[PDB]
């Protein structure tokens, strides 16, 4: 007997229809619009929203004025407000079922960098996230699938060790400066 974890689970689900036009076009449109890598990421976001919707339907099945329904409904509502895809005016459990997948794709770090104004295009935003140039509250992020919170949207900025945000110049700039000093002396 060894002391390991042995706990893991899938985060994406394969749809039953492999080849039909409309859902393929809709997923391909979402991949092109938000600049994602492959269909597994949008399937992962759909899987997470499906699990959230299943939990919301399970809470809405149980009758009013119960302790566990109110407790889990307020917990899930507070988490879904604090992740940034809900509003405090819409503070009800029956509005969870009306959410769409684009709302979950809005709070991704790549599109948040693209919409804040730190990159030209959304693909430029993704190759900025993968490049380690920015930070979220004095700590850099490399992963484009970094979901942000409502209080964490304002604090995103360039990292210290980056030529875009002020710091040491990169390899190609130093190589060109060395070439210029070699050609000059």
């Amino acid at each position: 007997p060894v002391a390991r974890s042995w706990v893991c689970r899938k985060t994406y689900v394969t749809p039953r229809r492999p080849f039909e036009k409309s859902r393929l076009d809709q997923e391909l449109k979402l991949i092109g619009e938000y600049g994602l890598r492959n269909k597994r990421e949008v399937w992962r976001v759909k899987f997470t929203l499906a699990k959230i919707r299943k939990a919301a339907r399970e809470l809405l099945t149980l009758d009013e004025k119960d302790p566990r329904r109110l407790f889990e409904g307020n917990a899930l509502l507070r988490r879904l407000v604090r992740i940034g895809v809900l509003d405090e005016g819409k503070m009800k459990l029956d509005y969870i079922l009306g959410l769409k997948i684009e709302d979950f794709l809005e709070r991704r770090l790549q599109t948040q960098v693209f919409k804040l104004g730190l990159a030209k295009s959304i693909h430029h935003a993704r190759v900025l996230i993968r490049q380690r140039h920015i930070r979220v509250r004095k700590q850099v992020v490399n992963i484009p699938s970094f979901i942000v919170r409502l209080d964490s949207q304002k604090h995103i900025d360039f990292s210290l060790r980056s030529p875009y945000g002020g710091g040491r110049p990169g390899r190609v700039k130093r190589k060109n400066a060395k070439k210029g000093q070699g050609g000059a002396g």
């Binding site: 339907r57 809405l60 029956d94 079922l97 009306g98 769409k100």
Partner: protein, 221 residues
Amino acid sequence: KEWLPVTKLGRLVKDMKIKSLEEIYLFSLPIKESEIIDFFLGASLKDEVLKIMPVQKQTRAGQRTRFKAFVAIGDYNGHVGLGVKCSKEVATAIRGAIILAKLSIVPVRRGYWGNKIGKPHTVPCKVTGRCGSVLVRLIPAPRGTGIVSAPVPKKLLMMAGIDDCYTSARGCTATLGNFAKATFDAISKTYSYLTPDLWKETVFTKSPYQEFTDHLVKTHT
């Protein structure tokens, strides 16, 4: 390219003295002129083919093939229709099918799943349509679920305006005409089901014919 009506309903809609198709559906008046609904429902009434199938008649010399065309009509916020036409060519068949489907359009109401919040989105009860051996059953669904079905009742429920369904079928579903007609019958049977939200006695509103007897005599013989 003008419209010359043959029934008094066509003229009475033509002179803008019938406001909507709702009282035609209320008084259960038959529709025989296809340009009335084109006068009422305009740019939002879209159509597409479902299946074109050939049938054969055996004669002395060779085989004669006539093409049968199916089509669905209906706007995304209510009414929906269906029509079947067969002809020797494809263009005549699709034009006759489009005309006959536009002529025969049913209304549908929408209900709620548990909580009556916002606009209605689903079928208010369990309805069943049957023709041949084809069975189809419609269940009310929670909001944001989406239509889960075969592709052809998915298309028909998109033209019906309902976006939340749970379906269950039985029989030979490969016959597209009977499956489409059974789903159309299941959609059209949603009014012959007395829920307790309309148990009050209705007030009998005024019939169009007797109200515009004077205009009918003034216009036509």
